[PDB]
Tab-separated table of C-alpha atoms and ligand atoms in Angstrom:
chain	number	residue	atom	x	y	z
L	1046	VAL	CA	-75.179	-19.445	-42.181
L	1047	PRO	CA	-73.127	-16.293	-41.312
L	1048	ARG	CA	-74.173	-14.381	-38.175
L	1049	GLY	CA	-72.679	-10.976	-37.303
L	1050	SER	CA	-74.757	-10.530	-34.133
L	1051	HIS	CA	-76.966	-12.711	-31.920
L	1052	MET	CA	-80.047	-11.546	-30.002
L	1053	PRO	CA	-79.934	-12.203	-26.197
L	1054	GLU	CA	-82.745	-14.822	-26.498
L	1055	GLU	CA	-80.480	-16.693	-28.963
L	1056	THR	CA	-77.306	-16.604	-26.807
L	1057	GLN	CA	-79.238	-17.349	-23.552
L	1058	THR	CA	-77.391	-20.328	-22.110
L	1059	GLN	CA	-79.301	-23.510	-21.243
L	1060	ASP	CA	-80.484	-23.581	-17.614
L	1061	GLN	CA	-78.489	-25.676	-15.161
L	1062	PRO	CA	-80.136	-29.093	-14.532
L	1063	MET	CA	-83.231	-28.588	-12.389
L	1064	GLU	CA	-82.385	-28.995	-8.688
L	1065	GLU	CA	-84.365	-31.428	-6.557
L	1066	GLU	CA	-85.081	-30.488	-2.923
L	1067	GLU	CA	-86.202	-33.056	-0.418
L	1068	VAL	CA	-89.033	-31.703	1.805
L	1069	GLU	CA	-90.258	-33.292	5.014
L	1070	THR	CA	-93.178	-32.089	7.088
L	1071	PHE	CA	-93.309	-32.568	10.845
L	1072	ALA	CA	-95.890	-32.032	13.613
L	1073	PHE	CA	-94.681	-29.723	16.334
L	1074	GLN	CA	-94.516	-31.395	19.735
L	1075	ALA	CA	-98.090	-31.068	21.196
L	1076	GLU	CA	-97.162	-28.473	23.820
L	1077	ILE	CA	-95.017	-26.493	21.376
L	1078	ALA	CA	-98.055	-26.368	19.035
L	1079	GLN	CA	-100.195	-25.274	21.970
L	1080	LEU	CA	-97.633	-22.565	22.879
L	1081	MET	CA	-97.341	-21.345	19.317
L	1082	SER	CA	-101.131	-21.058	19.098
L	1083	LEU	CA	-101.160	-19.178	22.366
L	1084	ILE	CA	-98.300	-16.778	21.317
L	1085	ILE	CA	-99.861	-16.122	17.965
L	1086	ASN	CA	-103.422	-15.468	19.018
L	1087	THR	CA	-103.014	-13.559	22.305
L	1088	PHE	CA	-102.287	-9.905	22.629
L	1089	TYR	CA	-98.996	-9.152	24.499
L	1090	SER	CA	-97.712	-5.649	25.034
L	1091	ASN	CA	-94.068	-6.551	25.300
L	1092	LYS	CA	-93.714	-8.205	21.832
L	1093	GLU	CA	-90.361	-6.567	21.077
L	1094	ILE	CA	-88.511	-9.121	23.195
L	1095	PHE	CA	-88.739	-11.471	20.224
L	1096	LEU	CA	-85.488	-9.909	18.952
L	1097	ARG	CA	-83.698	-10.339	22.314
L	1098	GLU	CA	-84.502	-14.104	22.075
L	1099	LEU	CA	-83.280	-14.545	18.510
L	1100	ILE	CA	-80.167	-12.450	19.160
L	1101	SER	CA	-79.532	-14.541	22.285
L	1102	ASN	CA	-79.617	-17.748	20.219
L	1103	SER	CA	-77.290	-16.225	17.652
L	1104	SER	CA	-75.068	-15.329	20.568
L	1105	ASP	CA	-75.152	-18.857	21.913
L	1106	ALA	CA	-74.286	-20.250	18.424
L	1107	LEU	CA	-71.409	-17.792	18.178
L	1108	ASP	CA	-69.953	-18.825	21.567
L	1109	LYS	CA	-70.034	-22.466	20.438
L	1110	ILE	CA	-67.706	-21.594	17.559
L	1111	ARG	CA	-65.092	-20.477	20.064
L	1112	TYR	CA	-65.515	-23.633	22.169
L	1113	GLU	CA	-65.725	-26.069	19.260
L	1114	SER	CA	-62.410	-24.624	18.143
L	1115	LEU	CA	-60.848	-26.353	21.189
L	1116	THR	CA	-61.620	-29.792	19.725
L	1117	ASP	CA	-61.789	-28.614	16.068
L	1118	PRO	CA	-59.005	-25.974	15.709
L	1119	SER	CA	-59.614	-26.119	11.923
L	1120	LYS	CA	-62.542	-23.663	12.604
L	1121	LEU	CA	-59.764	-21.144	13.637
L	1122	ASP	CA	-58.903	-21.188	9.901
L	1123	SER	CA	-62.277	-19.663	9.003
L	1124	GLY	CA	-61.928	-16.083	7.851
L	1125	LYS	CA	-65.551	-15.212	8.583
L	1126	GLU	CA	-66.145	-12.618	11.270
L	1127	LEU	CA	-68.240	-13.777	14.241
L	1128	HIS	CA	-71.167	-11.401	14.239
L	1129	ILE	CA	-74.891	-10.796	13.831
L	1130	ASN	CA	-76.436	-8.785	10.960
L	1131	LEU	CA	-80.004	-7.473	11.274
L	1132	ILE	CA	-81.541	-7.057	7.787
L	1133	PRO	CA	-84.964	-5.349	7.552
L	1134	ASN	CA	-86.570	-5.541	4.165
L	1135	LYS	CA	-89.384	-3.057	3.837
L	1136	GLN	CA	-90.176	-4.295	0.343
L	1137	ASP	CA	-90.675	-7.951	1.506
L	1138	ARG	CA	-91.829	-6.981	5.044
L	1139	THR	CA	-89.159	-9.338	6.425
L	1140	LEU	CA	-86.684	-8.961	9.209
L	1141	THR	CA	-83.692	-11.223	8.979
L	1142	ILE	CA	-81.289	-12.058	11.832
L	1143	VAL	CA	-78.141	-13.590	10.385
L	1144	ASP	CA	-75.356	-15.001	12.459
L	1145	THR	CA	-72.091	-16.733	11.689
L	1146	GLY	CA	-72.568	-19.198	14.570
L	1147	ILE	CA	-72.206	-22.983	14.321
L	1148	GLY	CA	-75.433	-23.422	12.308
L	1149	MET	CA	-77.770	-26.409	12.633
L	1150	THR	CA	-77.700	-29.760	10.879
L	1151	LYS	CA	-80.877	-31.190	9.405
L	1152	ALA	CA	-81.685	-33.218	12.498
L	1153	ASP	CA	-80.865	-30.181	14.686
L	1154	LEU	CA	-83.678	-28.299	12.916
L	1155	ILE	CA	-86.110	-31.175	13.332
L	1156	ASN	CA	-85.251	-31.904	16.985
L	1157	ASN	CA	-84.394	-28.433	18.315
L	1158	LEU	CA	-87.043	-26.397	16.556
L	1159	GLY	CA	-90.161	-28.426	17.059
L	1160	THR	CA	-90.275	-32.211	17.577
L	1161	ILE	CA	-88.654	-32.444	21.033
L	1162	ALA	CA	-90.584	-31.458	24.164
L	1163	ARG	CA	-89.182	-28.571	26.237
L	1164	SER	CA	-89.703	-29.211	29.910
L	1165	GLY	CA	-90.680	-25.594	30.718
L	1166	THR	CA	-93.472	-25.395	28.075
L	1167	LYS	CA	-96.357	-26.327	30.365
L	1168	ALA	CA	-95.170	-24.076	33.168
L	1169	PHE	CA	-94.687	-21.264	30.669
L	1170	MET	CA	-98.226	-21.610	29.392
L	1171	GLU	CA	-99.533	-21.661	32.919
L	1172	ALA	CA	-97.481	-18.552	33.826
L	1173	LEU	CA	-98.891	-16.740	30.766
L	1174	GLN	CA	-102.423	-17.882	31.776
L	1175	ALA	CA	-101.844	-16.264	35.174
L	1176	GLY	CA	-100.789	-13.059	33.342
L	1177	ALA	CA	-96.925	-13.267	33.120
L	1178	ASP	CA	-95.125	-10.816	30.802
L	1179	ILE	CA	-94.247	-12.495	27.468
L	1180	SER	CA	-90.640	-11.486	28.344
L	1181	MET	CA	-90.553	-14.421	30.764
L	1182	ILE	CA	-90.364	-16.739	27.735
L	1183	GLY	CA	-86.562	-16.405	27.944
L	1184	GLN	CA	-86.416	-18.258	31.211
L	1185	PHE	CA	-88.680	-21.213	30.158
L	1186	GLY	CA	-86.408	-22.439	27.312
L	1187	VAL	CA	-88.844	-21.817	24.480
L	1188	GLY	CA	-87.671	-18.334	23.366
L	1189	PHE	CA	-87.373	-19.119	19.641
L	1190	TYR	CA	-91.158	-19.208	19.409
L	1191	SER	CA	-91.351	-15.529	20.426
L	1192	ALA	CA	-90.657	-15.087	16.679
L	1193	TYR	CA	-94.430	-15.658	16.203
L	1194	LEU	CA	-95.303	-12.648	18.298
L	1195	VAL	CA	-94.302	-10.582	15.253
L	1196	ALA	CA	-94.090	-13.063	12.362
L	1197	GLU	CA	-96.930	-14.808	10.477
L	1198	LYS	CA	-94.239	-17.060	9.008
L	1199	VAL	CA	-90.689	-17.929	9.966
L	1200	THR	CA	-88.035	-19.429	7.706
L	1201	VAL	CA	-84.701	-20.515	9.110
L	1202	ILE	CA	-81.856	-21.075	6.680
L	1203	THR	CA	-78.906	-22.774	8.230
L	1204	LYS	CA	-75.567	-24.370	7.448
L	1205	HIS	CA	-73.478	-26.407	9.863
L	1206	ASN	CA	-69.980	-27.716	9.137
L	1207	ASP	CA	-71.312	-31.323	9.421
L	1208	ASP	CA	-74.243	-31.095	6.992
L	1209	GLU	CA	-75.640	-29.401	3.901
L	1210	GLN	CA	-77.725	-26.238	3.933
L	1211	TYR	CA	-81.354	-26.617	5.037
L	1212	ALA	CA	-84.432	-24.525	5.320
L	1213	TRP	CA	-86.841	-24.893	8.199
L	1214	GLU	CA	-90.158	-23.168	7.761
L	1215	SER	CA	-93.449	-22.781	9.635
L	1216	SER	CA	-96.573	-20.653	9.461
L	1217	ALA	CA	-97.534	-22.430	12.682
L	1218	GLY	CA	-100.930	-24.176	12.554
L	1219	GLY	CA	-99.185	-27.180	14.001
L	1220	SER	CA	-96.592	-28.343	11.502
L	1221	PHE	CA	-93.307	-27.238	9.991
L	1222	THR	CA	-91.208	-28.338	7.038
L	1223	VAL	CA	-87.492	-28.951	6.644
L	1224	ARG	CA	-86.035	-29.110	3.073
L	1225	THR	CA	-82.541	-29.225	1.565
L	1226	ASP	CA	-81.762	-25.692	0.456
L	1227	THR	CA	-79.818	-25.697	-2.826
L	1228	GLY	CA	-80.332	-21.975	-3.194
L	1229	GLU	CA	-78.012	-19.139	-2.157
L	1230	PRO	CA	-75.171	-20.782	-0.180
L	1231	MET	CA	-75.005	-18.898	3.045
L	1232	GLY	CA	-71.832	-20.321	4.532
L	1233	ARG	CA	-71.758	-21.495	8.146
L	1234	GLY	CA	-74.377	-19.979	10.417
L	1235	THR	CA	-78.094	-19.347	10.473
L	1236	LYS	CA	-80.479	-16.841	9.034
L	1237	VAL	CA	-83.881	-16.387	10.698
L	1238	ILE	CA	-86.267	-14.732	8.346
L	1239	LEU	CA	-89.305	-13.219	9.973
L	1240	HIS	CA	-92.243	-12.540	7.665
L	1241	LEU	CA	-93.814	-9.792	9.736
L	1242	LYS	CA	-97.519	-9.617	10.396
L	1243	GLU	CA	-99.160	-6.556	8.780
L	1244	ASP	CA	-99.234	-4.580	11.991
L	1245	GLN	CA	-95.726	-5.445	13.230
L	1246	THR	CA	-93.914	-3.455	10.550
L	1247	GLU	CA	-92.425	-1.094	13.136
L	1248	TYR	CA	-89.739	-3.778	13.347
L	1249	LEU	CA	-88.559	-2.873	9.901
L	1250	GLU	CA	-87.835	0.704	11.097
L	1251	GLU	CA	-84.187	1.397	11.817
L	1252	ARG	CA	-84.878	3.583	14.866
L	1253	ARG	CA	-87.123	0.901	16.406
L	1254	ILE	CA	-84.579	-1.850	15.833
L	1255	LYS	CA	-81.879	0.287	17.443
L	1256	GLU	CA	-84.161	1.034	20.463
L	1257	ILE	CA	-84.881	-2.623	21.180
L	1258	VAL	CA	-81.284	-3.816	20.714
L	1259	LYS	CA	-80.131	-1.133	23.133
L	1260	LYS	CA	-83.015	-1.996	25.562
L	1261	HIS	CA	-82.726	-5.774	25.490
L	1262	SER	CA	-79.483	-7.012	23.888
L	1263	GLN	CA	-76.561	-5.005	25.292
L	1264	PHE	CA	-74.266	-7.962	26.158
L	1265	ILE	CA	-74.178	-9.861	22.899
L	1266	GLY	CA	-70.386	-10.194	23.067
L	1267	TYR	CA	-70.186	-10.090	19.207
L	1268	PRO	CA	-70.675	-7.120	16.825
L	1269	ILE	CA	-74.260	-6.669	15.711
L	1270	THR	CA	-74.783	-4.644	12.597
L	1271	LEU	CA	-78.050	-3.193	11.301
L	1272	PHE	CA	-78.265	-3.094	7.481
L	1273	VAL	CA	-80.437	-0.119	6.437
L	1274	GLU	CA	-81.613	0.078	2.790
L	1275	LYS	CA	-81.061	3.631	1.487
L	1276	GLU	CA	-84.411	5.283	1.017
L	1277	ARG	CA	-84.914	5.799	-2.724
M	2155	APC	N1	-79.355	-18.832	15.443
M	2155	APC	C1	-79.283	-20.103	15.835
M	2155	APC	N2	-78.147	-20.778	15.580
M	2155	APC	C2	-78.064	-22.062	15.947
M	2155	APC	N3	-78.941	-22.783	16.642
M	2155	APC	C3	-80.067	-22.087	16.884
M	2155	APC	C4	-80.310	-20.779	16.524
M	2155	APC	N4	-81.583	-20.395	16.950
M	2155	APC	C5	-82.081	-21.461	17.530
M	2155	APC	N5	-81.202	-22.512	17.540
M	2155	APC	C6	-81.430	-23.817	18.143
M	2155	APC	O1	-82.749	-23.834	18.623
M	2155	APC	C7	-82.772	-24.304	19.994
M	2155	APC	C8	-84.006	-23.771	20.682
M	2155	APC	O2	-83.880	-22.376	20.940
M	2155	APC	P1	-84.753	-21.641	22.057
M	2155	APC	O3	-86.193	-21.943	21.739
M	2155	APC	O4	-84.347	-20.205	22.151
M	2155	APC	C9	-84.309	-22.498	23.611
M	2155	APC	P2	-82.541	-22.354	24.003
M	2155	APC	O5	-82.001	-21.025	23.564
M	2155	APC	O6	-81.797	-23.566	23.535
M	2155	APC	O7	-82.565	-22.354	25.590
M	2155	APC	P3	-82.159	-21.302	26.718
M	2155	APC	O8	-82.408	-19.875	26.286
M	2155	APC	O9	-83.043	-21.766	27.851
M	2155	APC	O10	-80.690	-21.630	26.882
M	2155	APC	C10	-81.408	-23.867	20.542
M	2155	APC	O11	-81.031	-24.687	21.638
M	2155	APC	C11	-80.511	-24.123	19.329
M	2155	APC	O12	-80.190	-25.492	19.249
M	2156	MG	MG1	-82.914	-19.272	23.224
């Protein structure tokens, strides 16, 4: 049956086998849930410090690369630059903080971002109740959750040398999921994707991002780059 030319629908290759992703749901530690609720549902005028916190954690992760190299000099062989990228997406209303730090293994996500008590949580909630600036969150060891000052939902994609890629995700309300992430390989590090609340879209603006990096994150110790989508 001679063919001279095939239509794209005819030549369209079979899909790869359908990937399976294991998803687990966890309760936040009680006080973490209480903090998240508090952060989410209280007005704070100094919300911008959320970025200082997430950049600080990227920073920490990036320092650990340097130190882990002292026991694991193999890491020295990586060609990836140690850096943070800030990626605002006006179309998706997301702000992404990407680092090339050490990343987090599956159990690191579960333990570090929600199941394990932080000892400063109760004091932080009390401080807030007595009218502390939200900025103080940095000194009470719960700074990650500042993400929820600006974000209705947070997704963390992460890849650590010792594990596969995972996605952590929470819209708060007391639980979070962790699933294997068989999607876009991201290489070692972590990507924190903030789905911004409708009225926190100033944090997609390049000038505003620049202002708060300059104000709050001047000692990263690693290049930070802001990716700005050309306006069409
Ligand atoms: N970008 C990132 N890369 C790797 N690990 C990250 C990360 N962001 C968060 N984490 C993990 O999440 C944990 C909790 O972060 P935070 O809530 O900011 C408290 P911390 O930064 O560990 O304490 P500290 O600021 O009192 O030192 C970190 O300890 C780290 O294990
Ligand atoms: Mg921190």
